[PDB]
PDB file of C-alpha atoms in Angstrom:
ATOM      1  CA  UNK A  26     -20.621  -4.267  19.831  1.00  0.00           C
ATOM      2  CA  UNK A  27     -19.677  -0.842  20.651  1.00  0.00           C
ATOM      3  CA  UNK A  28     -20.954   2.827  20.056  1.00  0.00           C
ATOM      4  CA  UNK A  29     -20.407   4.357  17.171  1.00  0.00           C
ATOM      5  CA  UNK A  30     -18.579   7.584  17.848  1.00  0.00           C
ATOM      6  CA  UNK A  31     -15.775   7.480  20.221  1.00  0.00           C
ATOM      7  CA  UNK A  32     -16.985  10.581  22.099  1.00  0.00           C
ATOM      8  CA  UNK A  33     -20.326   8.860  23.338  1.00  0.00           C
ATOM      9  CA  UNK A  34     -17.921   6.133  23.660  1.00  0.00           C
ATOM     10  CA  UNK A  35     -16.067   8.300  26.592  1.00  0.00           C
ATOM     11  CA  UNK A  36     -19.773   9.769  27.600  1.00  0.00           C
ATOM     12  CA  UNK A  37     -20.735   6.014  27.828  1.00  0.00           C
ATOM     13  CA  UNK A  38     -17.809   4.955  29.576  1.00  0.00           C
ATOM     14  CA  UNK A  39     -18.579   7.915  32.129  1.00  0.00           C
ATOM     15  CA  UNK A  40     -21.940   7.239  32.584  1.00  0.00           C
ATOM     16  CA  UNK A  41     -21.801   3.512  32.372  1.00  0.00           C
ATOM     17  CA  UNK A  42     -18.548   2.194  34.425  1.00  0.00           C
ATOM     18  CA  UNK A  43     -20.420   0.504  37.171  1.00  0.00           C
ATOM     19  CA  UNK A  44     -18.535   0.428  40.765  1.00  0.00           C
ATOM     20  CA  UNK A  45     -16.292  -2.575  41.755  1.00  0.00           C
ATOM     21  CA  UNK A  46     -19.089  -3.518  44.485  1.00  0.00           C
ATOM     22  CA  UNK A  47     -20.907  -4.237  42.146  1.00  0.00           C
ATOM     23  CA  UNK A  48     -18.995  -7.586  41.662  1.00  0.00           C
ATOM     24  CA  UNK A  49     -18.889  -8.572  45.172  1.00  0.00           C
ATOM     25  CA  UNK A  50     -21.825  -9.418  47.918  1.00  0.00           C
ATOM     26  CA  UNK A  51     -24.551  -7.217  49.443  1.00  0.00           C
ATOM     27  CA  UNK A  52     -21.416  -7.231  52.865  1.00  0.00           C
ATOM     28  CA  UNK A  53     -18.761  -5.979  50.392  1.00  0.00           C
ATOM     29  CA  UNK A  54     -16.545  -8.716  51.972  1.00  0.00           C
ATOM     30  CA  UNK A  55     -16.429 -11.147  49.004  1.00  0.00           C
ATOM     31  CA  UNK A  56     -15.674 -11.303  45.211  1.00  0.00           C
ATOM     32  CA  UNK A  57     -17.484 -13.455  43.127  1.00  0.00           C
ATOM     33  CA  UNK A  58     -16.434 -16.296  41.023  1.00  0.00           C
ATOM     34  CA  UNK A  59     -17.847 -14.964  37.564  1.00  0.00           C
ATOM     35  CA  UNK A  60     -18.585 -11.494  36.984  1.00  0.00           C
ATOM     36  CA  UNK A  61     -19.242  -9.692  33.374  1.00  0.00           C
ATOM     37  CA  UNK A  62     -19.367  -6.238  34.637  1.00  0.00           C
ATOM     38  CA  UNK A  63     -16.569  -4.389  34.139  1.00  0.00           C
ATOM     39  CA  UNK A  64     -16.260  -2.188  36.997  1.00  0.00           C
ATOM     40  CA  UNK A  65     -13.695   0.748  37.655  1.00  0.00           C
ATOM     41  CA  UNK A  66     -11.217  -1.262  38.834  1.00  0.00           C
TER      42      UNK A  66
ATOM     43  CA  UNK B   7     -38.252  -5.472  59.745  1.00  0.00           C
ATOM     44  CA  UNK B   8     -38.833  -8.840  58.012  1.00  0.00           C
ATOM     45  CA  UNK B   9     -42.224  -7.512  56.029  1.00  0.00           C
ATOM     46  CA  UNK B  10     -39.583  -4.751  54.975  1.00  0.00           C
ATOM     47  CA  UNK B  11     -37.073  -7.180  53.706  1.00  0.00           C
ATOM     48  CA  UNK B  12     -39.653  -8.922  52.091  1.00  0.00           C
ATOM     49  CA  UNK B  13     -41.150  -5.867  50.195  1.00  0.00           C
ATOM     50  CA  UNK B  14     -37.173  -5.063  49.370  1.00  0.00           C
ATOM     51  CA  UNK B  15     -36.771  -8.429  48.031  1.00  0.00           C
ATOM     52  CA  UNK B  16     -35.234  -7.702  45.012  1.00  0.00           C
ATOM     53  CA  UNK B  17     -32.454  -5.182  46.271  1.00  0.00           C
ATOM     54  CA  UNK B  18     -30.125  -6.340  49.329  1.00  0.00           C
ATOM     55  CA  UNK B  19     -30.049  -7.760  51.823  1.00  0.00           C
ATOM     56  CA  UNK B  20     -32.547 -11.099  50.722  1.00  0.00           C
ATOM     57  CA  UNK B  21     -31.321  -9.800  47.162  1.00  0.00           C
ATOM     58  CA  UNK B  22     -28.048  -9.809  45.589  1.00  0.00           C
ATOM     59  CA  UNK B  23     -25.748 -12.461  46.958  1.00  0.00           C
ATOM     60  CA  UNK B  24     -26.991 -12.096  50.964  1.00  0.00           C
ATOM     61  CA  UNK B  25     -24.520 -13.652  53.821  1.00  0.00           C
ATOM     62  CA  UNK B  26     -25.989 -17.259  54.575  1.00  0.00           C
ATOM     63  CA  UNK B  27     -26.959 -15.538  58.230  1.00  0.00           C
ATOM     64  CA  UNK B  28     -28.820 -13.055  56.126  1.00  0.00           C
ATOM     65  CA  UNK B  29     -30.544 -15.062  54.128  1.00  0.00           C
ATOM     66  CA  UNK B  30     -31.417 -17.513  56.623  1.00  0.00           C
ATOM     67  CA  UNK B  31     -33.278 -14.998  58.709  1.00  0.00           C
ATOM     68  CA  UNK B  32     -34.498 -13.449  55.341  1.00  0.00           C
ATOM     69  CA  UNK B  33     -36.490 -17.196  54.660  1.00  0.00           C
ATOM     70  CA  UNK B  34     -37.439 -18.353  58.440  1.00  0.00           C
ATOM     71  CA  UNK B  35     -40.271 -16.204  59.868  1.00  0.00           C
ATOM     72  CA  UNK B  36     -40.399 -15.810  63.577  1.00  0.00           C
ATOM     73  CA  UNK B  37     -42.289 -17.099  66.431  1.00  0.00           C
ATOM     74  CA  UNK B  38     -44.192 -15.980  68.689  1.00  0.00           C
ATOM     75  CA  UNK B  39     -42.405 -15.277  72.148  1.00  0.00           C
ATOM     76  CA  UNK B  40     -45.151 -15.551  74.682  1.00  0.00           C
ATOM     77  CA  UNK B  41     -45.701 -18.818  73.789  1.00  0.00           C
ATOM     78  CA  UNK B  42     -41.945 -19.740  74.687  1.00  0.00           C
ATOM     79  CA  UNK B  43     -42.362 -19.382  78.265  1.00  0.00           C
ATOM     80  CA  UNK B  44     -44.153 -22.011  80.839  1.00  0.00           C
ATOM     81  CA  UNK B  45     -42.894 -21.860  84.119  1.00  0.00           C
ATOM     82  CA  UNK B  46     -44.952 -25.405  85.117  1.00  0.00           C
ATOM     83  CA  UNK B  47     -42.926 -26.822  81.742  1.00  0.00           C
ATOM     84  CA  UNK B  48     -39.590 -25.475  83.053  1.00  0.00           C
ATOM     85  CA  UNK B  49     -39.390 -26.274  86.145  1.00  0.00           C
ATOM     86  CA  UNK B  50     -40.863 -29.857  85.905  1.00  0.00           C
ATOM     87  CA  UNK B  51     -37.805 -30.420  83.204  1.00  0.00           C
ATOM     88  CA  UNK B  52     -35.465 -29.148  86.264  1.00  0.00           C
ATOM     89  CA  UNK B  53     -36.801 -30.974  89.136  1.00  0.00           C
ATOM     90  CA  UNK B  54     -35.831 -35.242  88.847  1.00  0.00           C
ATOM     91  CA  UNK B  55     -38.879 -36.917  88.078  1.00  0.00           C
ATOM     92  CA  UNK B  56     -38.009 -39.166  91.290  1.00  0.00           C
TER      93      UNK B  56
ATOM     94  CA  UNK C  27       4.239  -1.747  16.252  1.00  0.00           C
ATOM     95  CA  UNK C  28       4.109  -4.491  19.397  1.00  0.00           C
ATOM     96  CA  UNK C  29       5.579  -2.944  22.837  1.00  0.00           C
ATOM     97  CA  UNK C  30       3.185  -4.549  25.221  1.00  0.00           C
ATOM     98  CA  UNK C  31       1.954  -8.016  25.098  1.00  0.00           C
ATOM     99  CA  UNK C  32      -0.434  -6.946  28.638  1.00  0.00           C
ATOM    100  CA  UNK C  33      -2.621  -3.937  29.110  1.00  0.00           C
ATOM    101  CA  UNK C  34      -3.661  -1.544  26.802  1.00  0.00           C
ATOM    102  CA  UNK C  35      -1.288  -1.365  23.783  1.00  0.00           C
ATOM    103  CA  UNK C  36      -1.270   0.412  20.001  1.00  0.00           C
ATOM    104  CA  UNK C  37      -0.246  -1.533  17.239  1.00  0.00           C
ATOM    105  CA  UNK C  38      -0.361   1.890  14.910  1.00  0.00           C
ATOM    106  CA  UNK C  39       0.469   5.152  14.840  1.00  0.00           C
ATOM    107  CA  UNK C  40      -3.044   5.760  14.328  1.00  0.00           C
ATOM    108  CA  UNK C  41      -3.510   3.699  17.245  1.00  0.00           C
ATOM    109  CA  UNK C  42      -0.678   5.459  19.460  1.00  0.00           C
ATOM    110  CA  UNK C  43      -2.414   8.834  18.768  1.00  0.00           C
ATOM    111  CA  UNK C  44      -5.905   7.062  20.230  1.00  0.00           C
ATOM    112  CA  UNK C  45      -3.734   5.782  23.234  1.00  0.00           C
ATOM    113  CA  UNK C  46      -2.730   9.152  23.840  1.00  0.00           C
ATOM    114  CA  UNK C  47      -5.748  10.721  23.298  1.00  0.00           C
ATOM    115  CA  UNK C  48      -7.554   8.179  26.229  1.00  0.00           C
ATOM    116  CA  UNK C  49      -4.233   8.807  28.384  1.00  0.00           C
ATOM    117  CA  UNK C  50      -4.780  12.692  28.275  1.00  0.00           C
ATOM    118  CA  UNK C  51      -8.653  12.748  28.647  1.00  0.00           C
ATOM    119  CA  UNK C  52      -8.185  10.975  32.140  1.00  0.00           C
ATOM    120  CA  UNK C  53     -10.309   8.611  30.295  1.00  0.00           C
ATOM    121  CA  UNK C  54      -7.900   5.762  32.469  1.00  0.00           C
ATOM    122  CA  UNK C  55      -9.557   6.239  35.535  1.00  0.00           C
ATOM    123  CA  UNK C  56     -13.151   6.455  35.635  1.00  0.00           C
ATOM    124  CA  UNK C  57     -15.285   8.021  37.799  1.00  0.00           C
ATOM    125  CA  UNK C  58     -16.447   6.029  41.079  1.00  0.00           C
ATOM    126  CA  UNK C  59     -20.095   4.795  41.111  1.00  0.00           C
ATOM    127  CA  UNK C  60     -22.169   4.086  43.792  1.00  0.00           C
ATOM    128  CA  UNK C  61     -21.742   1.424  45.836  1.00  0.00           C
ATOM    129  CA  UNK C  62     -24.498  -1.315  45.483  1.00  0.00           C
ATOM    130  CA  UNK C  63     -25.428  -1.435  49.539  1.00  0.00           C
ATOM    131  CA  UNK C  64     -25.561   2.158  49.580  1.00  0.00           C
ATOM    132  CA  UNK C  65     -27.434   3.476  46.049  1.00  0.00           C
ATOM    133  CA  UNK C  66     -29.691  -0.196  47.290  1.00  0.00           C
ATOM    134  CA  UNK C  67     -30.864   1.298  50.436  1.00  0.00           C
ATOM    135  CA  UNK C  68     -31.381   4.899  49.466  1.00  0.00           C
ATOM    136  CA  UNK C  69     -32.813   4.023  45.774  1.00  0.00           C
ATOM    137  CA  UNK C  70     -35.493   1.729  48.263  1.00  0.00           C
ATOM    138  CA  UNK C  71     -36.847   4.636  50.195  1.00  0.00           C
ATOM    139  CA  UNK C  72     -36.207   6.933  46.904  1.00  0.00           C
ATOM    140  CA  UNK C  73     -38.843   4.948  45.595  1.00  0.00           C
ATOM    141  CA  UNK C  74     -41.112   4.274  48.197  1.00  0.00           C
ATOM    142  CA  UNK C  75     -44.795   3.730  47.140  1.00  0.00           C
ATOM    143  CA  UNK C  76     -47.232   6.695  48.800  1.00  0.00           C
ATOM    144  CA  UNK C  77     -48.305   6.032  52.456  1.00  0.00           C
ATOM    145  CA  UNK C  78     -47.424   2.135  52.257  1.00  0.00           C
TER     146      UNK C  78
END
């Protein structure tokens, strides 16, 4: 589900768009095979 | 370093997805070095026993 | 309306406007985050407990 209002839908989106490192390995060397997050990228 | 890594546990590097290098020295503790060296041990495993 | 069967498409007018609305906002491109080693090893001495 999703917020309400599409403006703290973008303030969400700002706040909340994690980095694409966060789908990879402590190195940032690898991806991973199954990742939810759905980073900048 | 190790007790630090060990109090960090949850973040990287022993957290996360850690290298297997990192997370084998995050698991094995280490030894103690003094103990590692015997010169009587050493150089009776040099010399033949003839 | 069906122009795009990959990516981020309208299927309305309603919807175009929307489209155009995140396309204009720079609501495309989000801002970049901290990376995990990084905020990780500052957040840990951010956090530190006192004297320990």
């Amino acid at each position: 589900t999703y917020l309400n209002d599409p403006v703290s839908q973008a303030v969400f989106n700002i706040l909340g768009t994690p980095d694409y490192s966060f789908c990879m390995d402590n190195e940032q060397k690898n991806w991973l095979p199954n990742c939810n997050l759905m980073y900048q990228n | 370093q190790r007790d630090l890594y060990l109090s960090q546990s949850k973040s990287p590097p022993c957290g996360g997805n850690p290298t297997p290098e990192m997370n084998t020295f995050c698991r094995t503790a280490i030894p103690d070095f003094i103990s590692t060296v015997n010169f009587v041990k050493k150089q009776n495993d040099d010399t033949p026993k003839d | 309306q069906s122009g795009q069967d990959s990516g981020l498409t309208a299927k309305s007018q309603a919807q175009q406007a929307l489209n155009f609305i995140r396309y204009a906002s720079a609501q495309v491109t989000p801002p970049s985050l901290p990376k995990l080693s990084a905020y990780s090893e500052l957040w840990n001495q951010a956090t530190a407990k006192p004297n320990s």
